[PDB]
Structure 1
C-alpha cells in the first residue's frame, strides 16, 4: 500500500501514465514476463471455458480504457487476466476530452472520467504480436463525424481491426462523447450493428450503458438476438452521482463514475438480460467488480465473462489472481467441473 500512498498524491492521469510506461517495459523482457508468470502462473484448469466461439483460459479480463492504443498487449498475460480488450478506438484518430479528464473518489473507491490513435496504430501492433491470451477490440464513433456519417465510421473501423481481433465490442454507452448514448436507440443501432456484422466474421458485441430504462434494455436485447450478435457488455460508466462517499463531487463536473457504486446496477442489468436473452447470446458483466464473492454473484447470474477497470488501480498485482483462485475454490466447493456449468446457477435454481 506504500506505493499507492506514494502514487495516489500525484494526479491520477499522470500516475496512470507512469504505471503504463512501467508495464510496457516489462513486456520488453520476455523472461521477466515469463518470470512474473513463473511467480503466479498455475491457473486452475477448470476456470477455462469457451464463449461465443472463442475460448478463454480465465473469466476475468481488463476493461477498455487502460490501453486504448494497444501498446502493452504482451504485458497483460503476466498480470494474469484471462482475456484482454483494447480500449475504445475510432477509425480516425481523435484527441480525447481536454484536462482534467480523470478524478479520484477515494472513499467509495470510485473514479470519474475517447482519446485514441485510430485503427491504424492498433492494426500495426496486431500485425506483429503473438497473442498469449485472446484480445478484444472495442470500436467507437469518432467525435467529429456527424450522426448520419456515424454508421460509416463504425463500419470503416470494423474492417480494419476485425480480422486481427478475437471479438468486437460496439461502444454506444460511454457518456464522455456528445450524442453517443442516443445511438443506443434501437432504430439507429440496427444500421450500425448490421453493417459491422457483415464486414467481418469475428463475433461482434455491443456495450450498453447502466443509466438506461429497463424497457429500453429489453428492446436492445431483442435487437441483438435478431442480429445474432455474440454478446452484450454490461455496463459502461454511469452518469448518476448518487451514493458517493468522497467529498466535493459536485464541482468535478461531467463524467461517468465507475466502481463499487455502479455494481448494484450492473448486477440488476445482468439479472434482467440473462433471463431474456441468456441462451441466445453470451453476457459479459463489467463495472464494479473488486472481490471474489462479488465476481461469484456475477458468474452465478449468467456472466460468461467478467472485465473490470477500477479494481486494478486499488487492488494491485495479486488482485487478478486472487479472483481466479477465489472462483476456482467456489467451483470445487460447488462440485462443478468447468466454468460454463456454474454460469447461471443462481438463476436456474429459481
Structure 2
C-alpha cells in the first residue's frame, strides 16, 4: 500500500513522462521477464480460489492478452501475483504489425488506444520459448497457476480458419486454455468472424483440431469477443457456443467506439480503446452473455478493471475470472495485490464465502 501510492503517484507518472507507450511497454516486458519487480507480498486466501475450465486458479485475477504477446515474461507475471497468465495474440507466421506510433495514452480518461495489428514472433518462436519451460509450467498449473494462449491470424492469410487450426496444433499442447481471438479491431475482416455461419464453421474446425490432441495436451477452447456487438451478434454467438460445446468466453476485447466524455487529446486516434471508459460496456456484455448461456458457459471478464469493486462487479455479472491490462500501465505492479486485497474485503462485506459464491450473483437477485 505504501508502494501502491509510490508507484501510482510518483514512479508510473515519471516513467510515462520519459517514455512513449510502446517503449514503456517493451521496457516493462524486459523488467518483468528478469524478475525486477516489487514485493508481491499479498498471500492468496482460500476465498480467492476458483475451479473452472478443468483447472484450479488460486486467484481469479489474470493478465490479459497483449501485454506478453510473445511468451517472454510468463514467470515474472506469476511473480507479480496474477492467478493466471494469457500470452498472445500469436499469429502463425512472424509479422511486424502496424507502423509506429501505434499505442496512445489518454491519461485524463485512464484509457489507452492501440493499433498494434498483431505484431508477433510467430507460432514457431513462441512454441520453442514455451517448450523451454514446459515442465515448470506443468508444476505451476498443478499449483493453481494456469497458462492461456491467445491465437491470432496473419494479416495476409487467405484462410482464417487454417491460421487458427495451425495455432491449435502448435501451441495447444502447451496451453491450459486457448483463445480464439475473433475480436481484434486492428485486423481487417477479423471481427466478421463473429457472425453466425462463419463462426460455426471456424469453431467447428478449431474444436476438431483440439479434440485430435492427446488427452494430457488437450486445452479448453475459449472465444474472445468484442464489446461492440449487436444484440443479434450476441444471440448468435451464444447459440453457436452452446451448439458446439465451446468451453468459455472472454468478454471483452477493446472497443472501436469512443464513448461521449473522453478528454484525452488522442481520443480520435484509430484503434481499440481500453481502460476505464471500457469498464461498464464490458460488464454489461458479460451480463448479457451470461444470461444468454444460462450461466453454463464460464466467462473471463475483462475491460477497465482497476480495483476490487471493478472485479466484483464483473464476477457478480457472471464472470468466473477477470483479467486486467490497462490498469497496470497507470498503477504499475502494485495494482495486482490491490485488486485482490479489495476483492477479498468486498466478498466478506457482501456475505460471500468466496469468489465462487459470487459468480453470477446479480442474476439471482
For structure 1, the 5+ residue unaligned runs are 28-32
User: Contact 2:12–2:332 at 8 Å: present in 1 too?
Assistant: no
Match of 2:241 among 214, 217, 224: 224
1:341 Cα deviation (Å)? 1.3
Quick one: higher RCO (CA 8 Å, sep 6+), 1 or 2? 2
1:41 Cα deviation (Å)? 4.2
2:174 corresponding residue in structure 1: 164
- For 2:266 and 2:187, how far apart are their aligned partners in 1? 24
1:7 aligns with 2:8: no
SS at match of 1:81: coil
1:298 corresponding residue in structure 2: 314
1:18 corresponding residue in structure 2: 27
Query: Considering only aligned residues, what root-mean-square deviation do their CA atoms show, in Å?
Result: 1.5
2:152 corresponding residue in structure 1: 140
1:274 corresponding residue in structure 2: 290
Match of 2:132 among 128, 132, 145: 128
Deviating 4+ runs (over 4 angstroms): none
- For 2:58 and 2:320, how far apart are their aligned partners in 1? 12
Matches within 5 A, 1:80-99: 80-99=81-100
TM-score normalized by structure 1?
0.92
- For 1:279 and 1:14, how far apart are their aligned partners in 2? 41
Match of 1:115 among 92, 102, 119: 119
- For 1:36 and 1:262, how far apart are their aligned partners in 2? 29
Deviation string for 1:152-177 (max 9, x for gaps)?
A: 11111111010110001101101111
SS at match of 2:90: strand
1:75 aligns with 2:92: no
Aligned length: 337
- For 2:357 and 2:266, how far apart are their aligned partners in 1? 45
Matches within 5 A, 1:206-217: 206-217=223-234
1:246 corresponding residue in structure 2: 264
1:324 Cα deviation (Å)? 1.0
- For 1:233 and 1:61, how far apart are their aligned partners in 2? 12
SS at match of 2:86: strand
Match of 2:341 among 305, 325, 329: 325
Match of 2:328 among 312, 328, 339: 312
User: Contact 1:278–1:302 at 8 Å: present in 2 too?
Assistant: no
1:248 Cα deviation (Å)? 4.3
1:145 Cα deviation (Å)? 0.4
